[PDB]
Amino acid sequence: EVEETLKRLQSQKGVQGIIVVNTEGIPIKSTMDNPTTTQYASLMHSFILKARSTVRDIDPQNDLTFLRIRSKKNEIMVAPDKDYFLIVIQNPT
């Protein structure tokens, strides 16, 4: 089920790649080249952690619900997780 949805998403002209990072920067599934797969997993792992800390620092009884970072080249979205999150990159243009 989830694999079919990921394929359908990847087929969308906006989507530039999807990475499933599981064990804290260790992926299992990717639609991207290896150097980018590894770098992207690492960056988004560190990045989401920083956002979660920021929210807890603002209020000690709230965590992250969603995080989006945008750039000229592409846009990246992540969601909070218990064990692992999923990475999506799209071209906003």
């Binding site: 989830v2 694999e3 299992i28």
Partner: protein, 36 residues
Amino acid sequence: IKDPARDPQYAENEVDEMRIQKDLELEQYKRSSSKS
């Protein structure tokens, strides 16, 4: 005859999980890079 189709059968969550398991386990066994 092995009937890998399993046509006279039905399940929703059991077959979905099995597909998931098949892929994850198969890739893991390849990664083991056993010389055997």
